[PDB]
Amino acid sequence: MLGLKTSIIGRRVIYFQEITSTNEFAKTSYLEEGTVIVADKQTMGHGRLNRKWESPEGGLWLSIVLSPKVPQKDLPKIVFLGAVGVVETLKEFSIDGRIKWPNDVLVNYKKIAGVLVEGKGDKIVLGIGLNVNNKVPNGATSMKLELGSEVPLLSVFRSLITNLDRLYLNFLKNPMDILNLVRDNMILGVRVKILGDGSFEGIAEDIDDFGRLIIRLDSGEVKKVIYGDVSLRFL
Amino acid sequence: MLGLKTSIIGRRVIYFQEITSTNEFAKTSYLEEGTVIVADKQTMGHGRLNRKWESPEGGLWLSIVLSPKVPQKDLPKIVFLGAVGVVETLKEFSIDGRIKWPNDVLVNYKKIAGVLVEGKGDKIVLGIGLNVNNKVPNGATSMKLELGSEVPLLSVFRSLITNLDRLYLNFLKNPMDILNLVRDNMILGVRVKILGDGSFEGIAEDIDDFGRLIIRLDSGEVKKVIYGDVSLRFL
Ligand SMILES: O=C(O)CCCC[C@@H]1SC[C@@H]2NC(=O)N[C@@H]21
Ligand SMILES: O=C(O)CCCC[C@@H]1SC[C@@H]2NC(=O)N[C@@H]21
């Protein structure tokens, strides 16, 4: 009844009225690649750095099960697929979202979506949380708040899954393709504070072929930031 | 993201772009009571007498896993649950459907839906096929054909599942209540040809509290038909 016409992602969709975390269900479960897990609300939603992710009724909280057959050196680019997909969908609904390295999607610097990619063996779980009609913490925003009107959840879901399937199909063919889309939708050219192994500032210049963020230190020297236990803040 | 608020039926929904039959997946699968299986299309959909059920894109093809804890003598009333739920849903979409004993729903004598209940012990599978926006065989009808425009499948789904959940809870509380709803929406008072173990005609007078159809033969005697390998045709 959902009417999806995708090739890999969304061939099957499992919906729960309530769940602890769609990412956790994807990890403890054995499901076919492309299967989408979605819930009206999550009681224990979480983000990167393992922080709480508010998941009230009205938002889009989903997880996608994947087993990407691509070189291990390319797998890290998977986190960008989710962010680009959200940006393309936002565009379809007249919203201009930008990517905050490495997984956040902001609108006028307000967080409207987050991406959480987790790995368990050869399985990869791509989790996406997008604010649509739900209330959000102060500082954040939603599609409803941006458009000043509710937006049918199914339509957004349909749009996002369709974009992700296309992006994924291309990813399997050539993992490098996603890079040009990320670069052209990412927030760069501004000064940022990085909290990884230590602490330093600089301009978010660009990301490289591996997906690492290129920071141009004031000393004209550079520092590459890898995805993981890292925090980025705009100064 | 479907936003169902049901207590039992629809706490979980599994969707497939394509499937052989939702009724077959609902059986051969371990699933919690209330779980709903739905697909855009079925390649091997079938009905009551094992005839093919055309399931193209545009209609609602679903199956519900159930394990009602009620006396075995009231289980046969389960098939009426689906038929009444469809009638109540059609009412909500300004359509006047009536029940053709024991599982069909007609609009001006044209079949708009069929109900197929299958058992496997304690586990019961309630299957429903409702023509919405799909092309239908000659003689049949659909919500689109009745209304003059397409009807959002999700809205019909939400409506049907919500009605089925309410009816099911009342059913577990008192299996007899569904009968008055059936009588009030079933086609009665007309002559029908019955094809069960033999062949006879008569007026479809009413149904008894077991769910058996009361046929009053021309002689003056009445004959009772139980759900099973029986066919009914309006004369
Ligand atoms: O911004 C982040 O740090 C990532 C947030 C990811 C949120 C989604 S909601 C669907 C899925 N289930 C979870 O518990 N997290 C992800
Ligand atoms: O009219 C009948 O005789 C019963 C038709 C039942 C059709 C539904 S479609 C969903 C489910 N899957 C099937 O194969 N049959 C039922």
Side-chain angles (χ1 to χ4, degrees):
Chain A
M1 56 149 279
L2 299 184
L4 290 172
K5 303 183 180 308
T6 49
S7 300
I8 296 178
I9 306 181
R11 291 196 260 48
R12 299 174 185 180
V13 173
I14 303 173
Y15 155 88
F16 294 82
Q17 273 182 40
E18 190 187 325
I19 198 174
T20 47
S21 170
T22 60
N23 255 41
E24 282 302 303
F25 183 71
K27 288 189 296 180
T28 61
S29 298
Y30 183 87
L31 302 165
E32 289 192 0
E33 289 78 7
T35 295
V36 182
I37 301 304
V38 68
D40 292 320
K41 49 199 290 182
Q42 292 184 131
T43 59
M44 294 148 114
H46 56 273
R48 184 165 58 70
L49 283 14
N50 325 271
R51 283 221 234 180
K52 169 78 168 185
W53 177 263
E54 298 309 315
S55 310
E57 177 289 307
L60 191 54
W61 327 120
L62 61 83
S63 294
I64 309 168
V65 170
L66 303 172
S67 291
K69 269 80 173 55
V70 299
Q72 292 298 57
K73 272 287 189 174
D74 292 312
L75 229 32
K77 298 179 206 58
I78 281 290
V79 189
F80 300 132
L81 289 183
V84 176
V86 166
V87 173
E88 305 186 325
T89 289
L90 287 177
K91 209 312 237 151
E92 286 173 48
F93 287 78
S94 306
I95 289 180
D96 180 42
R98 308 212 65 64
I99 302 179
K100 171 187 171 175
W101 191 87
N103 65 310
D104 307 307
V105 174
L106 316 179
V107 175
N108 302 339
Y109 280 102
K110 300 180 62 56
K111 189 171 187 175
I112 199 171
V115 181
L116 176 62
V117 179
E118 296 181 278
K120 189 182 181 184
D122 294 299
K123 171 168 63 184
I124 290 178
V125 176
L126 173 61
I128 304 173
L130 169 68
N131 299 309
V132 185
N133 306 313
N134 56 291
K135 290 292 190 182
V136 298
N138 191 211
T141 188
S142 65
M143 291 180 76
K144 181 180 179 183
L145 290 174
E146 291 301 316
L147 299 176
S149 167
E150 291 201 304
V151 188
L153 269 181
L154 173 51
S155 67
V156 177
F157 175 78
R158 179 194 308 300
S159 165
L160 181 55
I161 297 309
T162 299
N163 281 320
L164 297 169
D165 186 65
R166 188 240 316 159
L167 288 172
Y168 189 58
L169 264 164
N170 288 334
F171 181 80
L172 295 184
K173 291 176 181 179
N174 182 358
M176 293 298 159
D177 265 57
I178 193 61
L179 288 179
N180 85 113
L181 293 179
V182 170
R183 294 198 184 82
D184 284 69
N185 285 292
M186 183 166 43
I187 299 173
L188 298 174
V190 295
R191 195 184 183 76
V192 304
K193 167 143 293 181
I194 297 186
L195 299 192
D197 46 54
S199 174
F200 63 82
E201 316 188 318
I203 303 298
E205 186 172 291
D206 172 2
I207 61 155
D208 55 27
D209 299 327
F210 303 77
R212 319 183 204 170
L213 183 58
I214 304 174
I215 297 297
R216 180 64 57 169
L217 299 186
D218 302 307
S219 301
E221 202 83 338
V222 299
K223 169 69 177 183
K224 291 181 147 110
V225 182
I226 308 104
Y227 176 107
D229 180 51
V230 54
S231 181
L232 189 160
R233 180 168 65 73
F234 294 115
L235 303 180
Chain B
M1 51 95 185
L2 300 183
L4 295 179
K5 303 179 181 305
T6 53
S7 302
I8 297 184
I9 306 183
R11 279 171 296 184
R12 303 181 182 192
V13 176
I14 304 175
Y15 153 95
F16 296 80
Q17 273 182 37
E18 180 176 55
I19 203 163
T20 49
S21 170
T22 57
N23 253 45
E24 280 303 306
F25 182 73
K27 308 165 162 180
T28 184
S29 305
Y30 39 95
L31 298 167
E32 174 186 51
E33 159 172 283
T35 295
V36 183
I37 304 307
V38 67
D40 294 323
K41 42 188 290 196
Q42 290 182 134
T43 55
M44 293 287 287
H46 56 269
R48 201 164 106 237
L49 293 173
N50 296 294
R51 305 183 77 185
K52 183 178 189 66
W53 177 262
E54 298 310 309
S55 310
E57 167 183 322
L60 195 63
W61 325 122
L62 59 78
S63 293
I64 304 169
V65 171
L66 299 177
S67 216
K69 279 85 178 299
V70 308
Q72 292 291 298
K73 296 281 195 171
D74 304 313
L75 233 23
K77 278 171 262 159
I78 283 294
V79 69
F80 296 132
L81 290 179
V84 172
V86 169
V87 172
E88 303 188 328
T89 289
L90 293 179
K91 281 188 169 77
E92 288 172 34
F93 286 71
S94 66
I95 294 172
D96 182 24
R98 288 192 300 176
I99 305 172
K100 168 184 171 177
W101 187 89
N103 69 314
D104 306 315
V105 175
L106 314 181
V107 178
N108 191 186
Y109 280 97
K110 304 188 67 178
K111 191 173 190 174
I112 199 172
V115 179
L116 175 68
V117 177
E118 289 181 281
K120 213 187 186 182
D122 303 313
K123 286 287 189 173
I124 300 178
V125 178
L126 166 59
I128 303 169
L130 171 63
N131 298 311
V132 184
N133 305 315
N134 56 292
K135 296 288 206 133
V136 300
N138 182 50
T141 191
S142 67
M143 293 179 70
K144 184 181 176 186
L145 288 173
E146 290 300 319
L147 300 183
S149 76
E150 293 194 301
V151 185
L153 276 178
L154 175 52
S155 67
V156 183
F157 180 83
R158 179 194 313 298
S159 172
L160 183 56
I161 293 302
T162 296
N163 278 317
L164 290 171
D165 187 63
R166 179 183 65 262
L167 290 168
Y168 188 54
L169 278 163
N170 291 323
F171 179 79
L172 298 184
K173 288 173 179 181
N174 179 4
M176 254 61 207
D177 292 323
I178 194 62
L179 283 170
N180 61 98
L181 293 178
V182 174
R183 297 198 190 85
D184 298 349
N185 293 283
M186 183 176 53
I187 299 171
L188 298 177
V190 297
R191 195 181 182 66
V192 303
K193 169 77 71 175
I194 304 300
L195 302 185
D197 271 15
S199 173
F200 63 91
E201 313 183 311
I203 302 300
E205 194 179 76
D206 200 300
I207 60 176
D208 56 47
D209 282 36
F210 285 83
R212 306 177 299 205
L213 181 64
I214 306 302
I215 298 297
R216 194 163 95 173
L217 310 164
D218 302 317
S219 59
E221 294 293 69
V222 305
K223 200 149 158 190
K224 297 180 188 170
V225 186
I226 59 174
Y227 179 85
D229 184 53
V230 180
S231 187
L232 187 159
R233 178 169 62 83
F234 289 113
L235 299 176

